[PDB]
Design an enzyme around this catalytic site. Structure first.
Site, PDB file in Angstrom:
ATOM      1  N   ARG A  54     -46.795 -48.639   6.679  1.00 41.23           N
ATOM      2  CA  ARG A  54     -45.762 -49.419   5.907  1.00 41.23           C
ATOM      3  C   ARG A  54     -45.380 -50.475   6.787  1.00 41.23           C
ATOM      4  O   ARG A  54     -45.550 -50.879   7.753  1.00 41.23           O
ATOM      5  CB  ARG A  54     -43.965 -48.394   6.809  1.00 41.23           C
ATOM      6  CG  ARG A  54     -43.655 -47.244   5.942  1.00 41.23           C
ATOM      7  CD  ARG A  54     -43.030 -46.556   6.676  1.00 41.23           C
ATOM      8  NE  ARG A  54     -42.535 -46.901   8.034  1.00 41.23           N
ATOM      9  CZ  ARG A  54     -42.332 -46.852   9.049  1.00 41.23           C
ATOM     10  NH1 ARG A  54     -41.405 -47.988   8.718  1.00 41.23           N
ATOM     11  NH2 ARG A  54     -41.996 -47.414  10.507  1.00 41.23           N
ATOM     12  N   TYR A  77     -49.682 -45.800  -0.743  1.00 41.93           N
ATOM     13  CA  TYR A  77     -49.651 -45.162   1.042  1.00 41.93           C
ATOM     14  C   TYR A  77     -47.708 -44.317   1.536  1.00 41.93           C
ATOM     15  O   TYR A  77     -46.987 -44.708   1.254  1.00 41.93           O
ATOM     16  CB  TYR A  77     -50.419 -46.510   2.026  1.00 41.93           C
ATOM     17  CG  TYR A  77     -50.506 -45.760   3.083  1.00 41.93           C
ATOM     18  CD1 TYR A  77     -51.926 -45.260   3.441  1.00 41.93           C
ATOM     19  CD2 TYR A  77     -50.059 -45.039   4.517  1.00 41.93           C
ATOM     20  CE1 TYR A  77     -52.388 -44.289   5.093  1.00 41.93           C
ATOM     21  CE2 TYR A  77     -49.879 -44.713   5.391  1.00 41.93           C
ATOM     22  CZ  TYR A  77     -50.953 -44.445   5.768  1.00 41.93           C
ATOM     23  OH  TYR A  77     -51.435 -43.728   6.979  1.00 41.93           O
ATOM     24  N   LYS A 103     -39.582 -41.101   4.292  1.00 41.87           N
ATOM     25  CA  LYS A 103     -38.088 -41.636   4.776  1.00 41.87           C
ATOM     26  C   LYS A 103     -37.315 -42.474   3.593  1.00 41.87           C
ATOM     27  O   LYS A 103     -36.278 -43.209   4.063  1.00 41.87           O
ATOM     28  CB  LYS A 103     -39.673 -43.371   5.252  1.00 41.87           C
ATOM     29  CG  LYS A 103     -40.478 -42.807   5.956  1.00 41.87           C
ATOM     30  CD  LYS A 103     -40.001 -41.544   7.509  1.00 41.87           C
ATOM     31  CE  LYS A 103     -40.599 -41.669   8.535  1.00 41.87           C
ATOM     32  NZ  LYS A 103     -40.571 -41.241   9.893  1.00 41.87           N
ATOM     33  N   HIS A 158     -34.085 -38.528  11.694  1.00 37.44           N
ATOM     34  CA  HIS A 158     -35.211 -39.216  12.225  1.00 37.44           C
ATOM     35  C   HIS A 158     -35.688 -38.405  13.224  1.00 37.44           C
ATOM     36  O   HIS A 158     -36.130 -38.747  14.617  1.00 37.44           O
ATOM     37  CB  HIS A 158     -35.598 -40.307  12.491  1.00 37.44           C
ATOM     38  CG  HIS A 158     -37.243 -40.766  12.966  1.00 37.44           C
ATOM     39  ND1 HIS A 158     -37.406 -41.849  13.901  1.00 37.44           N
ATOM     40  CD2 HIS A 158     -38.303 -40.254  12.387  1.00 37.44           C
ATOM     41  CE1 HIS A 158     -39.479 -41.811  13.347  1.00 37.44           C
ATOM     42  NE2 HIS A 158     -39.414 -40.635  12.295  1.00 37.44           N
ATOM     43  N   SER A 187     -42.201 -43.860  16.514  1.00 38.40           N
ATOM     44  CA  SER A 187     -43.442 -43.636  16.032  1.00 38.40           C
ATOM     45  C   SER A 187     -44.160 -43.685  17.234  1.00 38.40           C
ATOM     46  O   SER A 187     -44.170 -44.295  18.407  1.00 38.40           O
ATOM     47  CB  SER A 187     -44.132 -44.653  15.061  1.00 38.40           C
ATOM     48  OG  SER A 187     -45.935 -44.310  14.484  1.00 38.40           O
ATOM     49  N   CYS A 224     -44.834 -42.059  20.088  1.00 35.50           N
ATOM     50  CA  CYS A 224     -43.553 -40.757  21.005  1.00 35.50           C
ATOM     51  C   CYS A 224     -43.757 -39.587  20.835  1.00 35.50           C
ATOM     52  O   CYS A 224     -42.968 -38.750  21.802  1.00 35.50           O
ATOM     53  CB  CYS A 224     -42.442 -41.413  21.027  1.00 35.50           C
ATOM     54  SG  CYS A 224     -42.125 -43.480  21.321  1.00 35.50           S
ATOM     55  N   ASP A 252     -40.270 -34.557  11.597  1.00 34.98           N
ATOM     56  CA  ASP A 252     -39.796 -35.106  11.348  1.00 34.98           C
ATOM     57  C   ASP A 252     -38.567 -36.087  10.866  1.00 34.98           C
ATOM     58  O   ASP A 252     -38.070 -36.983  11.512  1.00 34.98           O
ATOM     59  CB  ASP A 252     -40.190 -35.942  10.269  1.00 34.98           C
ATOM     60  CG  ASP A 252     -40.761 -37.611  10.363  1.00 34.98           C
ATOM     61  OD1 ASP A 252     -40.772 -38.835  11.420  1.00 34.98           O
ATOM     62  OD2 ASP A 252     -40.453 -37.927   9.243  1.00 34.98           O
ATOM     63  N   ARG A 273     -53.114 -40.320   8.767  1.00 37.54           N
ATOM     64  CA  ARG A 273     -52.197 -38.884   8.744  1.00 37.54           C
ATOM     65  C   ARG A 273     -52.981 -38.278   7.957  1.00 37.54           C
ATOM     66  O   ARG A 273     -54.227 -38.088   7.106  1.00 37.54           O
ATOM     67  CB  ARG A 273     -51.254 -39.473   8.011  1.00 37.54           C
ATOM     68  CG  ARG A 273     -50.258 -40.763   8.327  1.00 37.54           C
ATOM     69  CD  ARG A 273     -49.359 -40.032   9.584  1.00 37.54           C
ATOM     70  NE  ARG A 273     -48.426 -40.954   9.760  1.00 37.54           N
ATOM     71  CZ  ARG A 273     -47.116 -41.172  10.540  1.00 37.54           C
ATOM     72  NH1 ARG A 273     -46.940 -39.631  10.769  1.00 37.54           N
ATOM     73  NH2 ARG A 273     -46.764 -42.194  10.901  1.00 37.54           N
TER      74      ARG A 273
END
Ligand code: GTP
Ligand code: MN
Ligand code: MN
Ligand code: MN
Ligand code: NA
Length: 610
Positions: free
Chosen positions: A85, A233, A242, A262, A284, A286, A309, A403
């Site tokens: 991103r 992507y 997202k 999130h 992200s 974590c 997520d 991913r």
């Protein structure tokens, strides 16, 4: 009607029918067909046949490789310019900037990026006209959430990328059933193009179509539109991931009285056969996915996954906070995933899974940093850059944020109610990030208002702010988002979940983790479970409640340094409140709700009395 034959695109439809589409869907498809000028229109049906054939087509074109070691698994290696991103190229369009981001007191907003309608229209006109020339425009009808769910929302994505179609089939509920359920109802308009019309003006890199220089991911909440150009992507292309799930949805949530967050959703069962659902917001890197699919070390305990997520949550008529996972799969970070760190993910991803930017072994398997699995003598590695790679080189074999894309139904511990239309009742909300110093393993907010403050004060890692783990994702003014969260306390019969903050990442003076984490985090979840039940297991501190002495089950862990792990320093927290003060003053400014400011004052005062 038409005076010629340039508006009716019926002759270019290669699957389905424009006539069978709902009126507003047809207008969306045909209008963008007229603009983008695709060669063909493929209306997706979501079938296995359509899926398998498209994968085979990508394979023959060299767009993806088949991973022969596993059952129907695939690998894509992208243009290195199109690897993640791009926040600087991710925008939200509104009449007034203040509705998208608070106007900062001193500096630039880090809570979003506003673009005027005027500037977007120029940008749009400079990108989309004729952008699908020589390509198939795919029509992806998808549901975000279980089909019949009152919490579900429907989208229509147009894309010129078969990679997007295959990935959307996994990540969303996609196909003919969605169109039939939609009817003349409302939907989110999602438009995507890789930005490489044929003939190609610029050389194709690694068989991965993208336009880095012109990449722009735009959100128009008032028009209910997502418009993305130049990137193939992940979050830039899978417009449910997202753009819909967090940015558009959080705006809709604000309007309609719910929450789009999130957050993972997990179900936890104790040895007494009692089950509670929890949600957790970490940024992200974590470990949401690790927690969501946890294999608990504590005997008699069970963890089940609803989602890893995104959480869509709404207080019902009974005051229960009902949550659904709006996704249909897991788009997980590959590097760091091992049998030790995430054994349940290891099990899930060995069939029907698409991998992106990981390394490939000679026997057709997958490889990445932190996989913690040795290879047999002879087995060699090809990196994500399609290059020969040795385990001791000064370069990672997989991209740091590479991913996997796997179906949720394949998870061995997938929750029995993971796609129940009514959702699951959240009894606890967890916040957390990477804090090497000062922040205890676990603490509990003193109230809903303090809990909202704790989410707002979230920091991670250079240590940067990431309130609610939503910094890259706010669909509107963060100050108004805070007010929206606070307003839930004044809702009829609302059962406000208990709020906790965790830190898996506290280190000692030598830089090693004080807490073993992963499966051992079931010990933290046990304490949370008890606190929700009203157990007298908490000690009051200036930052909130922490576990009592001997409250945390440490059996089988040896000698954990609890005093350092749960240590609260006046000097650290004096600095903490100061930095939180400066941050909220600048970044939220005039839109900082009275109660958040009050909680900051309150925390400051408690620390002063240490
Ligand atoms: N020390 C420690 N590290 C953890 C723990 N849980 C997860 N991690 C780390 O977190 C990283 C993986 O987390 P991510 O998959 O990137 O986190 P995420 O929230 O799922 O990220 P997104 O999918 O982008 O939303 C790895 O580096 C893990 O080592 C833990 O309990 N203890
Ligand atoms: Mn994840
Ligand atoms: Mn995420
Ligand atoms: Mn209030
Ligand atoms: Na490729």
């Amino acid at each position: 009607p038409q005076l010629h034959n340039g508006l009716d695109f019926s002759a270019k439809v290669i699957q389905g029918s424009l006539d069978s589409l709902p009126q507003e869907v047809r207008k969306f498809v045909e209008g963008n067909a007229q603009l983008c000028q695709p060669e063909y229109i493929h209306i997706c049906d979501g079938s296995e046949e359509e899926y398998g054939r498209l994968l085979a087509h990508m394979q023959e074109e060299g767009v993806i490789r088949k991973l022969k070691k596993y059952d129907n698994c695939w690998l894509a290696l992208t243009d290195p310019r199109d690897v993640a991103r791009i926040e600087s190229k991710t925008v939200i369009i509104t009449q007034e900037q203040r509705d998208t981001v608070p106007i900062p007191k001193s500096g630039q907003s880090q809570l979003g990026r506003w673009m005027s309608e005027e500037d977007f229209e120029k940008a749009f006109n400079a990108r989309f006209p004729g952008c699908m020339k020589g390509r198939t425009m795919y029509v992806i009808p998808f549901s975000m959430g279980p089909l019949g769910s009152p919490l579900a929302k429907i989208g229509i994505e147009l894309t010129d990328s078969p990679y997007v179609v295959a990935s959307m089939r996994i990540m969303t509920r996609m196909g003919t059933s969605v169109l039939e359920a939609l009817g003349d109802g409302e939907f989110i308009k999602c438009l995507h193009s890789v930005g490489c019309p044929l003939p190609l003006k610029k050389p194709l890199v690694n068989n991965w179509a993208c336009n880095p220089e012109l990449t722009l991911i735009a959100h128009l909440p008032d028009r209910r539109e997502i418009i993305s150009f130049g990137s193939g992507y992940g979050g830039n292309s899978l417009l449910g991931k997202k753009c819909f799930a967090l940015r558009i949805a959080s705006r809709l949530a604000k309007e309609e009285g719910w929450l789009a967050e999130h957050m993972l959703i997990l179900g936890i069962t104790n040895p007494e056969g009692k089950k509670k659902y929890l949600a957790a917001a970490f940024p992200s890197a974590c470990g949401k996915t690790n927690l969501a699919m946890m294999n608990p070390t504590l005997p008699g305990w069970k963890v089940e996954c609803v989602g890893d997520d995104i959480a869509w949550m709404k207080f019902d008529a009974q005051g229960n906070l009902r949550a659904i996972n709006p996704e249909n799969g897991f788009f997980g970070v590959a590097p760091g995933t091992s049998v030790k760190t995430n054994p349940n993910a290891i099990k899930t991803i060995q069939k029907n899974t698409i991998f992106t930017n990981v390394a490939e072994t000679s026997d057709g398997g997958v490889y990445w940093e932190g996989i913690d699995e040795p290879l047999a003598p002879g087995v060699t590695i090809t990196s994500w850059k399609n290059k020969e790679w040795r385990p001791q080189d000064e370069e990672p074999c997989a991209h740091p944020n590479s991913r996997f894309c796997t179906p949720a139904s394949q998870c061995p511990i997938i929750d029995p109610a993971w796609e129940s239309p009514e959702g699951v009742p959240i009894e606890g909300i967890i916040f957390g990030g990477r804090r090497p110093a000062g922040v205890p393993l676990v603490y509990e907010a003193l109230s809903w208002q303090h809990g909202v403050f704790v989410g707002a004060a979230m920091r991670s890692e250079v240590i940067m702010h990431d309130p609610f783990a939503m910094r890259p994702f706010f669909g509107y003014n963060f100050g108004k988002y805070l007010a929206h969260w606070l307003s839930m306390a004044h809702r009829p019969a609302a059962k406000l979940p208990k709020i906790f903050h965790v830190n898996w990442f506290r280190k000692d003076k030598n830089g090693k983790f004080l807490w073993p984490g992963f499966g051992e985090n079931s010990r933290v979840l046990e304490w949370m479970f008890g606190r929700i039940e009203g157990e007298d297991s908490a000690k009051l501190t200036p930052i909130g409640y922490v576990p009592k002495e001997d409250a945390l089950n440490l059996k089988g862990l040896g000698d954990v340094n609890v005093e350092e792990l749960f240590g609260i320093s006046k000097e650290f927290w004096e600095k903490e409140v100061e930095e939180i003060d400066k941050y909220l003053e600048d970044q939220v400014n005039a839109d900082l709700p009275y109660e958040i400011e009050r909680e900051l004052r309150a925390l400051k005062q408690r620390i002063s009395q240490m």
